[PDB]
Design an enzyme around this catalytic site. Sequence first.
Site, PDB file in Angstrom:
ATOM      1  N   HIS A 124       1.120   4.154  -2.781  1.00 39.04           N
ATOM      2  CA  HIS A 124       0.832   5.540  -2.431  1.00 39.04           C
ATOM      3  C   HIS A 124       1.968   6.526  -2.721  1.00 39.04           C
ATOM      4  CE1 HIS A 124      -2.915   4.101  -0.650  1.00 39.04           C
ATOM      5  NE2 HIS A 124      -3.263   5.349  -0.403  1.00 39.04           N
TER       6      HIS A 124
ATOM      7  N   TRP B 180     -11.325  -7.702   2.583  1.00 40.94           N
ATOM      8  CA  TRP B 180     -11.956  -8.003   1.304  1.00 40.94           C
ATOM      9  C   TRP B 180     -12.060  -9.511   1.114  1.00 40.94           C
ATOM     10  CZ3 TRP B 180      -8.156  -4.115   1.786  1.00 40.94           C
ATOM     11  CH2 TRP B 180      -8.450  -2.824   1.286  1.00 40.94           C
TER      12      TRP B 180
ATOM     13  N   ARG C 147       0.848  -1.184   0.000  1.00 38.05           N
ATOM     14  CA  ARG C 147       0.000   0.000   0.000  1.00 38.05           C
ATOM     15  C   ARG C 147       0.890   1.242   0.000  1.00 38.05           C
ATOM     16  NH1 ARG C 147      -2.754   3.285   4.573  1.00 38.05           N
ATOM     17  NH2 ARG C 147      -4.227   4.504   3.313  1.00 38.05           N
TER      18      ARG C 147
HETATM   19  C1  ZNH Z   1      -9.297   3.006  -7.150  1.00 40.03           C
HETATM   20  C2  ZNH Z   1      -8.198   2.632  -6.388  1.00 40.03           C
HETATM   21  C3  ZNH Z   1      -8.029   2.359  -5.006  1.00 40.03           C
HETATM   22  C4  ZNH Z   1      -8.661   2.860  -3.851  1.00 40.03           C
HETATM   23  C5  ZNH Z   1      -9.819   3.858  -3.716  1.00 40.03           C
HETATM   24  C6  ZNH Z   1      -7.992   2.285  -2.716  1.00 40.03           C
HETATM   25  C7  ZNH Z   1      -8.278   2.572  -1.410  1.00 40.03           C
HETATM   26  C8  ZNH Z   1      -7.685   2.060  -0.270  1.00 40.03           C
HETATM   27  C9  ZNH Z   1      -8.212   2.273   1.028  1.00 40.03           C
HETATM   28  C10 ZNH Z   1      -9.404   3.176   1.416  1.00 40.03           C
HETATM   29  C11 ZNH Z   1      -7.489   1.455   1.828  1.00 40.03           C
HETATM   30  C12 ZNH Z   1      -7.639   1.309   3.335  1.00 40.03           C
HETATM   31  C13 ZNH Z   1      -6.670   2.055   4.226  1.00 40.03           C
HETATM   32  C14 ZNH Z   1      -6.888   1.756   5.687  1.00 40.03           C
HETATM   33  O1  ZNH Z   1      -5.908   1.449   6.395  1.00 40.03           O
HETATM   34  O2  ZNH Z   1      -8.049   1.829   6.125  1.00 40.03           O
HETATM   35  C15 ZNH Z   1      -6.557   0.745   1.004  1.00 40.03           C
HETATM   36  C16 ZNH Z   1      -5.758  -0.312   1.405  1.00 40.03           C
HETATM   37  C17 ZNH Z   1      -4.916  -1.095   0.647  1.00 40.03           C
HETATM   38  N1  ZNH Z   1      -4.711  -0.834  -0.694  1.00 40.03           N
HETATM   39 ZN1  ZNH Z   1      -6.095   0.018  -1.942  1.00 40.03          ZN
HETATM   40  N2  ZNH Z   1      -7.007   1.431  -3.089  1.00 40.03           N
HETATM   41  C18 ZNH Z   1      -6.992   1.480  -4.459  1.00 40.03           C
HETATM   42  C19 ZNH Z   1      -6.040   0.834  -5.184  1.00 40.03           C
HETATM   43  C20 ZNH Z   1      -5.015   0.020  -4.765  1.00 40.03           C
HETATM   44  C21 ZNH Z   1      -4.002  -0.491  -5.623  1.00 40.03           C
HETATM   45  C22 ZNH Z   1      -3.955  -0.119  -7.109  1.00 40.03           C
HETATM   46  C23 ZNH Z   1      -3.155  -1.231  -4.800  1.00 40.03           C
HETATM   47  C24 ZNH Z   1      -1.869  -1.774  -4.994  1.00 40.03           C
HETATM   48  C25 ZNH Z   1      -1.289  -2.332  -6.079  1.00 40.03           C
HETATM   49  C26 ZNH Z   1      -3.743  -1.160  -3.475  1.00 40.03           C
HETATM   50  C27 ZNH Z   1      -3.331  -1.836  -2.344  1.00 40.03           C
HETATM   51  C28 ZNH Z   1      -3.797  -1.757  -1.058  1.00 40.03           C
HETATM   52  C29 ZNH Z   1      -3.446  -2.642   0.024  1.00 40.03           C
HETATM   53  C30 ZNH Z   1      -2.568  -3.884  -0.104  1.00 40.03           C
HETATM   54  C31 ZNH Z   1      -4.148  -2.246   1.143  1.00 40.03           C
HETATM   55  C32 ZNH Z   1      -4.258  -2.935   2.533  1.00 40.03           C
HETATM   56  C33 ZNH Z   1      -3.413  -2.307   3.637  1.00 40.03           C
HETATM   57  C34 ZNH Z   1      -3.559  -2.980   5.001  1.00 40.03           C
HETATM   58  O3  ZNH Z   1      -4.601  -3.605   5.269  1.00 40.03           O
HETATM   59  O4  ZNH Z   1      -2.613  -2.871   5.808  1.00 40.03           O
HETATM   60  N3  ZNH Z   1      -4.827  -0.360  -3.473  1.00 40.03           N
HETATM   61  N4  ZNH Z   1      -6.655   1.144  -0.288  1.00 40.03           N
END
Ligand code: ZNH
Lengths: 294, 108
Positions: A52, A191, A48
Amino acid sequence: TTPLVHVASVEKGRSYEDFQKVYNAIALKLREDDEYDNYIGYGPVLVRLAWHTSGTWDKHDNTGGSYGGTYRFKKEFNDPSNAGLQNGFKFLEPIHKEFPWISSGDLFSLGGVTAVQEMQGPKIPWRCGRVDTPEDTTPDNGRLPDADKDADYVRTFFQRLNMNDREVVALMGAHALGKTHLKNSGYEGPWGAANNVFTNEFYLNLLNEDWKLEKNDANNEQWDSKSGYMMLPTDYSLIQDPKYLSIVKEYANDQDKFFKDFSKAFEKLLENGITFPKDAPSPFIFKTLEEQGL
Amino acid sequence: TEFKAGSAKKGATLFKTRCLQCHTVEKGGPHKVGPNLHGIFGRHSGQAEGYSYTDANIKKNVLWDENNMSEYLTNPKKYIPGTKMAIGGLKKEKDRNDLITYLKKACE
Ligand code: ZNH
Ligand code: HEC
């Protein structure tokens, strides 16, 4: 007037095994401190983080991206949508005082690659050459996507990162990992059931479960199932849109195709904005801890 | 054992209402959504003939004894990641014990 050409420079006198040893350090700490966020581990939040720092790129005037390692500066660090990632940085900090030569971005991106591979996912080709850039080239907040939206938004948003239908449907499957924390973004729940193992769970859950719409404890709306799972509006938008529905259905029946598409799409995301010289090394494919003895 | 043993008549209606829709227990029985559970116990995961398992169910290769079997039923996708067994799981221990008692006798 043209944007900024960020030319990739390999860190002074380093190659494959220097970077492989940076992998093994993040990987060793990934498995040993797997108590985190109720036994999910640090794996999901690192991918993540690699997203980002990379998703702050805008193709028009090539500003942002993974290159500069600009997450370290307060402005990017304290971005509202960048909440919770701090722990992901906190994780990577003792390994950055073990290897002070590697760039911040090169390490952040490497964190995601090593997180996914260790989580039994596809092996993602990785390249070095990112260089640390000063405080004034720190991207300004809000560049990252907004969860509460639909099909048209995700399509037009991802156009900015140069991702197509096939690519965004492949990148979203990383949601099979970890969970949405309400304290961080106003959404709660996982999820799927396998939070720390990279599979095609995200799609199988998208089409085989019975989804209902409801409000949460931070009064944002989300899709929930009886089995205790959840989907963001941007996640459920992948089956409303008929063009995205076909690709979800495809990845559901064949995991290998998804695994190959994700590596292509993930690498591209982390390589966005970077312009590699042709005297640069061919992409490194690292060996996991399971293959390297452990 | 660790898992004790329950009523097999109550295990018969837990299967008929929560597992029959995809599984059949009889000898030489037909695979439908899921495989034919005949001689599942003592047998490794992903080895009933003529059925196409997801690579996750085969690379897990556990020997189905009533203990790891109860760890499976409580949350299938946590136990075998990437399994296409579309189920939430039985969250109560008696429902698990009542059902595996039936499954061990019906799957003999
Ligand atoms: C349209 C579009 C979109 C949106 C609105 C989102 C949104 C988001 C949110 C609201 C969260 C939560 C934070 C906290 O700590 O509470 C996350 C987480 C998240 N994310 Zn994801 N994403 C997305 C795409 C994405 C992609 C394209 C990838 C890669 C390749 C991802 C991988 C992720 C991971 C592996 C996680 C988990 C982290 C933990 O649990 O530690 N993601 N993300
Ligand atoms: C359909 C919607 C299903 C229901 C209802 C149940 N199961 Fe299932 N099961 C299903 C599939 C599609 C598969 C194969 C999964 C894969 O990833 O390939 C399975 C598998 C099993 C197995 C393992 C078989 C083996 O290792 O050879 C067992 C032991 C099993 N299922 C048991 C089981 C029980 C007792 C259920 C009822 C409460 C149940 N399943 C329901 C699909 C579906």
